[PDB]
Design an enzyme around this catalytic site. Structure first.
Site, PDB file in Angstrom:
ATOM      1  N   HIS A  41      54.981  14.533  54.810  1.00 63.46           N
ATOM      2  CA  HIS A  41      54.431  13.310  55.398  1.00 63.46           C
ATOM      3  C   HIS A  41      53.632  13.565  56.640  1.00 63.46           C
ATOM      4  O   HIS A  41      53.705  14.629  57.322  1.00 63.46           O
ATOM      5  CB  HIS A  41      55.546  12.241  55.621  1.00 63.46           C
ATOM      6  CG  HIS A  41      56.360  12.458  56.866  1.00 63.46           C
ATOM      7  ND1 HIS A  41      56.707  11.427  57.699  1.00 63.46           N
ATOM      8  CD2 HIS A  41      56.897  13.587  57.417  1.00 63.46           C
ATOM      9  CE1 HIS A  41      57.437  11.889  58.711  1.00 63.46           C
ATOM     10  NE2 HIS A  41      57.529  13.210  58.590  1.00 63.46           N
ATOM     11  N   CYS A  95      55.837  13.882  64.448  1.00 65.52           N
ATOM     12  CA  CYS A  95      57.157  14.204  64.054  1.00 65.52           C
ATOM     13  C   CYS A  95      57.243  15.718  64.083  1.00 65.52           C
ATOM     14  O   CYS A  95      56.222  16.445  63.854  1.00 65.52           O
ATOM     15  CB  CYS A  95      57.326  13.732  62.619  1.00 65.52           C
ATOM     16  SG  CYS A  95      58.959  13.888  61.973  1.00 65.52           S
ATOM     17  N   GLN A 113      64.766   6.378  55.732  1.00 59.25           N
ATOM     18  CA  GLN A 113      64.585   4.930  55.888  1.00 59.25           C
ATOM     19  C   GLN A 113      64.167   4.364  54.564  1.00 59.25           C
ATOM     20  O   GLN A 113      63.482   5.003  53.745  1.00 59.25           O
ATOM     21  CB  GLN A 113      63.549   4.644  56.913  1.00 59.25           C
ATOM     22  CG  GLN A 113      64.004   5.045  58.286  1.00 59.25           C
ATOM     23  CD  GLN A 113      62.798   5.247  59.191  1.00 59.25           C
ATOM     24  OE1 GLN A 113      61.775   5.909  58.822  1.00 59.25           O
ATOM     25  NE2 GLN A 113      62.899   4.695  60.366  1.00 59.25           N
ATOM     26  N   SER A 136      59.897   3.904  62.232  1.00 61.44           N
ATOM     27  CA  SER A 136      59.435   5.048  63.025  1.00 61.44           C
ATOM     28  C   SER A 136      57.933   4.999  63.272  1.00 61.44           C
ATOM     29  O   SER A 136      57.463   5.640  64.212  1.00 61.44           O
ATOM     30  CB  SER A 136      59.678   6.384  62.314  1.00 61.44           C
ATOM     31  OG  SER A 136      61.014   6.479  61.995  1.00 61.44           O
ATOM     32  N   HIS A 139      53.462   6.021  57.823  1.00 62.01           N
ATOM     33  CA  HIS A 139      53.451   7.368  57.172  1.00 62.01           C
ATOM     34  C   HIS A 139      52.356   7.405  56.083  1.00 62.01           C
ATOM     35  O   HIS A 139      52.069   6.383  55.473  1.00 62.01           O
ATOM     36  CB  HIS A 139      54.747   7.671  56.464  1.00 62.01           C
ATOM     37  CG  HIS A 139      55.989   7.502  57.322  1.00 62.01           C
ATOM     38  ND1 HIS A 139      56.739   8.565  57.793  1.00 62.01           N
ATOM     39  CD2 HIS A 139      56.586   6.365  57.786  1.00 62.01           C
ATOM     40  CE1 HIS A 139      57.801   8.083  58.434  1.00 62.01           C
ATOM     41  NE2 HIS A 139      57.709   6.748  58.473  1.00 62.01           N
TER      42      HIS A 139
END
EC number: 5.2.1.8
Length: 145
Positions: A41, A95, A113, A136, A139
Site C-alpha cells: 500500500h 507509513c 482496519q 489512518s 490508501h
C-alpha cells in the site's frame, strides 16, 4: 457482473466502464475467497488521521482533500506507467512499510482496519484499488498474492 462491480458511463466520453464500490477501482473492461492475501500500500495521511505524523513529516497538516488529490496523482502516474507503485510507496507513503516498497506481507481477515481488509480481499491478484479511506488516511492498495 461479479459482486461489488457496477456499470457506469464516462461523463466525458459516454463510453461504458465498470467501477467497484468496495475497492474504488475503475476499469474499461467488463470484469468477471483465500485464507490470506498479501498486499502492498501507499498511505497518504491528513490532519484527521488517527495519528497525523509519519517518518516523512512530524506534524501532518494537509486536509483530507489535499491528501485525496495526492492519491489521485499517484494513481494516474502508476496507471500511465510513468512511475512504479513500489517507487512511489517508498518515497511517499506515510507509513513505515514505505521502507519495504509498501509491502505489508500476508494477512487474514481480522487483522487490518475493516475498509482496508475488504478492499484487499475484493481485489484480484495483481489488481490495484482506487482511493481507500480508513482512520489512518487514504490508501492505494496493491494485491500481490
Amino acid at each position: 457482473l461479479p459482486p461489488g462491480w457496477e456499470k457506469a458511463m464516462s461523463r466525458s466520453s459516454g463510453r461504458v466502464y465498470y467501477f467497484n464500490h468496495i475497492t474504488n477501482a475503475s476499469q474499461w473492461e467488463r470484469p468477471s475467497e483465500p485464507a490470506r492475501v498479501r498486499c502492498s500500500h501507499l498511505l497518504v495521511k491528513h490532519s484527521q488521521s488517527r495519528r497525523p505524523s509519519s517518518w516523512r513529516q512530524e506534524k501532518i497538516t494537509r486536509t483530507k482533500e489535499e491528501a485525496l488529490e495526492l492519491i489521485n496523482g499517484y494513481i494516474q502516474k502508476i496507471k500511465s506507467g510513468e512511475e512504479d507503485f513500489e517507487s512511489l510507496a517508498s518515497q511517499f507513503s506515510d507509513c513505515s512499510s514505505a521502507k519495504a516498497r509498501g509491502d505489508l506481507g500476508a494477512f487474514s481477515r481480522g487483522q487490518m482496519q475493516k475498509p482496508f481488509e475488504d478492499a484487499s480481499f475484493a481485489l484480484r491478484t495483481g489488481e490495484m484499488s482506487g482511493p481507500v479511506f480508513t482512520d489512518s488516511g487514504i490508501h492505494i492498495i496493491l494485491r500481490t498474492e
